Structure formats: C-alpha cells, structure tokens
Ligand binder design. Structure first.
Ligand SMILES: CC(=O)c1ccc(N)cc1O
Ligand SMILES: CC(=O)c1ccc(N)cc1O
Length: 282
C-alpha cells in the first residue's frame, strides 16, 4: 500500500502495536559473540543491545578492537551510517578513535547528557574553547572551535588532532536538544528541519566517511533518523515514489543492527516524518 493512506488505515484501526510486533518477529538474528566476551562488559551500556559480528566497527588496535557500533550500508539509496551507543566514561577515547579512523565529518547526537534524572551518556566534548580535552588512551586532542545554539538544536565546530601524526580535522557536532523525556515529538517539523541541516553540511555525502549517529542505546531515536533520511532519498531516486515501503526499509536496516525503532510510537512518528518530509521536498 501507499504510505499516507496505510497510515490513516492503521490510525483508524488502532493497530500500531500489532504492526510493530510483526516487524519484531520478522527481524534478523545474527551472532554478537565479540560483544558478549567478558573483557568487553564495561564497553556496553545495556546488556541487551549489542552489535552483530558481521557489521560491527573494528578499532585499529591489536589489544582490543571492540566498540558498540554498527555499519548500516544502504545499497540502493547509496548512503551509509554508523549507529552507536552514547559513550561511557571508559569509552570516550574509543569513540573519537572511531571518528578518526572511519574519516567521518559529522556526529549526530539525539539525546541530552541527563534525561529523567539519570546520566544517558558521558560529557564527551569540551564546553569551553580554552578548556580542551586530551584522550590519553588513544592519543587524541579535541578542541571546541565555535558553537551556535538554536531553539531546537545546537551545532558545534570541533577540531580533532591525532597527536601521533599532528594531523588535524574539522568535525561538525549536530545536537538535537528537544526530544521529550517521554514519548515522541507531537510534530515532525523540527526533526525534519534538523535532518536537512545535517544534509546541507556535507556530513552525509559520499566524499566523507559515514556519519556517526547516537542516542543512549543507539537504536531508537537513532533508528528514526536514518530510516527517515533513507526513505526520503529513495522517494527522490525512484520513478514511482509511492513504491517506497517503510516497513521493508526498516527490516533491511535491521540486518545491520538489532532493535532499530524501539516502540510503536517511534514507528508511527517515522511514518509521520517521511509523509510530511515528502511534501516539502517538492
Ligand atoms: C582530509 C580528511 O581526511 C578529513 C577527514 C575527515 C574530516 N572530518 C576532515 C578531513 O579533512
Ligand atoms: C554551524 C553550521 O551549521 C555549519 C554549516 C555548514 C558548514 N559547512 C559547517 C557548519 O558548522
């Protein structure tokens, strides 16, 4: 079926939970043996969210190459994304090592450091220009260059230096700051505006390594971001845009990381975002 009328048909019939459970039942199951090794317990935020072995990002290190991060490679859309958990106190250096080694231009953050009164990720970037951060375990230096605070999101320019080679690179930090502590946004308008700002920066384009996207577990809000981006790109590429099937795209993405889209409300919100976004594109 088309999307907008499939949408009204699920609303009128109140069957979002049944649609979402079908997706959960059909989703791929692949091994994640490296994630479950005892030496990696303090590298995982949640025991039930792990990268598959076949798609995990490897650190360029011979001691321990593990990070909780996955490469989502969308062949028809010609887009790739790295989805990862919010960094932990003992993985902030690994996080920036990955950004460096994968040649990423942008980092997309969809959570606040504290939500619901608890810490959802480490404070992994500097908050003042004159107070830079050094990650001694991976030999990197990170400096805040500029910060632009808007009503729904903040964009930061960061300098990452590889202290071993003295090479430097400019990284863009795109921080969506207004996702509610509970539920999903009422309108997708600010989320879509944010997606378009990431696109306009070059961070999603083939001349760079894959964008790094995270929330707390790296599957819920993060899944919503890449699902909406890929669906809108396919609607532009195909002769028949009504052929784009958001459930099929989501199941393709779940071949590369488990659990993408965590609730039926996030599924409905993803439909809403693609529907409204397709009108603005034209
Ligand atoms: C030139 C290069 O390798 C490079 C990679 C990533 C980045 N954010 C900036 C850069 O200049
Ligand atoms: C601050 C911001 O929105 C921004 C835009 C374009 C670009 N090439 C780099 C940037 O940091």
């Amino acid at each position: 079926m088309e999307m907008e009328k499939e949408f009204e048909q699920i609303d009128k019939s109140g069957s979002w939970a049944a649609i979402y459970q079908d997706i959960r039942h059909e989703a791929s199951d692949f091994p994640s043996r490296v994630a479950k090794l005892p030496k990696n317990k303090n590298r995982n935020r949640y025991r039930d969210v792990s990268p598959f072995d076949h798609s995990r990002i490897k650190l360029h290190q011979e001691d321990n190459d593990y990070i909780n991060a996955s490469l989502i490679k969308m062949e028809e859309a010609q887009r790739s994304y790295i989805l990862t958990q919010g960094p932990l106190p003992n993985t902030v250096g690994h996080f920036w090592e990955m950004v460096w080694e994968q040649k990423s231009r942008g980092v997309v953050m969809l959570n606040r450091v504290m939500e619901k009164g608890s810490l959802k990720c480490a404070q992994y970037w500097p908050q003042k220009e004159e107070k830079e951060m050094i990650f001694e375990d991976t030999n990197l230096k990170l400096t805040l260059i500029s910060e632009d605070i808007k009503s729904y999101y903040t964009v930061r320019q960061l300098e990452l230096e590889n202290l071993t080679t003295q090479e430097t690179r400019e990284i863009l930090h795109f921080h969506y700051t207004t996702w509610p502590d509970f539920g999903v946004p009422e309108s997708p308008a600010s989320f879509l505006n944010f997606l378009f700002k990431v696109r306009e920066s070059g961070s999603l384009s083939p001349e760079h390594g894959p964008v790094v996207v995270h929330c707390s577990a790296g599957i819920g809000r993060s899944g919503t971001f890449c699902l909406a981006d890929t669906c809108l790109l396919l609607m532009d590429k195909r002769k028949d845009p009504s052929s784009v099937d958001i459930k099929k795209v989501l199941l393709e993405m779940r071949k590369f990381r488990m659990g993408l889209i965590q609730t039926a409300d996030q599924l409905r919100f993803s439909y809403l975002a693609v529907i409204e976004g397709a009108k603005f594109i034209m």
